[PDB]
C-alpha cells in the first residue's frame, strides 16, 4: 500500500510541490500544497483568476459551518476565510476519510500562482503555530486520532519544467532511499525546528558562532524554495561560494537571486560551485551527521540555453532548509519519535565527480550552545 503513495506528488518549480486531495460530499477534488512550514488546511472557496476551480460548500452535504473567521500571512502570500470541517480524503494516500479542519478562502494576495495547478494548502506542521490559535486541530493531528495511520510521514521531492515526488503518509518507504537514515531531534513542535551545529563549504568550515546558524530558529520547510539564511550566515555562505566561483563573474543581481544566469547548453560549469555541507544534531551525546548539497540543487534551472536563479537567499527570522535542500533525499517526519530521518534519495542528482550524501557519525562538542534563545 505504500506503493500507491509512490509518486502522488507533482509540480512546477518554484511553486510548491502539491498531492491530489478530496473535499466534503460528494467529493470535489482539488491539488494542495504540501507544506511542513505552516499547519492550516486551506482552499480556495470563491473565484479567483488564477483558480481552475474551488471548493463549494453549498455543493457538499457534510460541510459545516464554524461561524469563524481566520487569516494566514506566509511569507510569501497571505488570505483570509471562513472555518469549517468537512470530509476528507487522499485518493493516492492511505484508505480513509477523516472529518478536519477546513478554511474556506474568501480572499487572497499574492498566495495563489498563475497556472501553478494547486488550489490549496495542507500545513503539515503543528497545532502550536495553526491561525487562529493553537485550538484549530492541524489535518494531520486529525488524520491520526480518527484512524490507525500512524503519526509519521515522509517527503521524497524530485526536482526536474514540472517536478515529481512522493509523500508517504504513516510509514517509511524503503524503496525510496539508499543507504542509511540519519536523524536529528524537532527541538521543539511548532514548525519543524532543528538544530544546525556546524556548516561548511567545499570542506572549509565556515567557523562562525554556531548560534548564528540558528540565529531566531532553523526549519524545516517543504512550502519554501530557496535554502534561506540569515543576514550574517548568508554573507559568509555567499563570500565563499563567490571566491569558489570566482573564475567567472556574475551581476550581482544574480546573487541577490534576482537575475538568470545562462551558459551554452550542457556547458555549465558545475565543478566551479562548492557543495556546502549542513551537520545537524544527531541522536546520541556528542554526535551529528552531515547533509551534503550540490550545486544543481541550490542553482534552480529557469527558462538554446541552460539557465539558473541562485536559489540560496537571505532572511531574517532563521534558518529555512527548503526544497532545494529536500531535493535528492527522502526526508522522515516522525512525528512519534519526535525526529527528522535524511538519507540519500533514489532521486538524487548526477554528477559524475561529485554526490550528494548523508553522512554520520560525527562528534560535534557543546551541540546544546547552537540552540537560539
Ligand atoms: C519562519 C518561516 C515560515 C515559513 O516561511 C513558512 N513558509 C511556508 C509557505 C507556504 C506557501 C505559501 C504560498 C505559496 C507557496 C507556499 C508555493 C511556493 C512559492 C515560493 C515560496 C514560498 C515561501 C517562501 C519563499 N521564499 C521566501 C519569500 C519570498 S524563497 C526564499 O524565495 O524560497 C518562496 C513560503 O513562505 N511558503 C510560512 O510562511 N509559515 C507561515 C505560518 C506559520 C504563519
Known sequence: ???????????????????????????????????????????????????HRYYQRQLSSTYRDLRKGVYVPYTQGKWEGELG?????????????????????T??????????????????????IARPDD???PFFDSLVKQTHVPNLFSLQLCGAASVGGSMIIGGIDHSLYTGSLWYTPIRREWYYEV????VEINGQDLKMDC??????????????????????????????????????????????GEQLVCWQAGTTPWNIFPVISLYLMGEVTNQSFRITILPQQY??????????????????????????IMEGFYVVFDRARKRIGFAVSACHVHDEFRTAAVEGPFVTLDMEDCGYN
Request: aromatic share 10%; hydrophobic share 40%.
Open 1 to 51: 500500500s505504500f506503493v500507491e503513495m509512490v509518486d502522488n506528488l507533482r509540480g512546477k518549480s518554484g511553486q510548491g510541490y502539491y498531492v491530489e486531495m478530496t473535499v466534503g460530499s460528494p467529493p470535489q477534488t482539488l491539488n494542495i500544497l504540501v507544506d511542513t512550514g505552516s499547519s492550516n488546511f486551506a482552499v480556495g472557496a470563491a473565484p479567483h483568476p488564477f483558480l
Open 85 to 105: 470541517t468537512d470530509l476528507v480524503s487522499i485518493p493516492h494516500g492511505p484508505n480513509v476519510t477523516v472529518r478536519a479542519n477546513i478554511a474556506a478562502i
Open 107 to 128: 480572499e487572497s494576495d499574492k498566495f495563489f500562482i498563475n497556472g501553478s495547478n494547486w488550489e490549496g494548502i495542507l500545513g503539515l506542521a503543528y497545532a502550536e
Open 135 to 137: 485550538s484549530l486541530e
Open 195 to 198: 538544530i544546525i551545529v556546524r
Open 211 to 256: 548560534k548564528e546558524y540558528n540565529y531566531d530558529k532553523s526549519i524545516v520547510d517543504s512550502g519554501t524554495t530557496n535554502l534561506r539564511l540569515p543576514k550574517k550566515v548568508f554573507e559568509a555562505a555567499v563570500k565563499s561560494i563567490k571566491a569558489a566561483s570566482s573564475t567567472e563573474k556574475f551581476p550581482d543581481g544574480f546573487w541577490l
Open 299 to 324: 542553482l534552480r534551472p529557469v527558462e538554446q540555453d541552460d539557465c539558473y536563479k541562485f536559489a540560496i537567499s537571505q532572511s531574517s527570522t532563521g534558518t529555512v532548509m527548503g526544497a532545494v
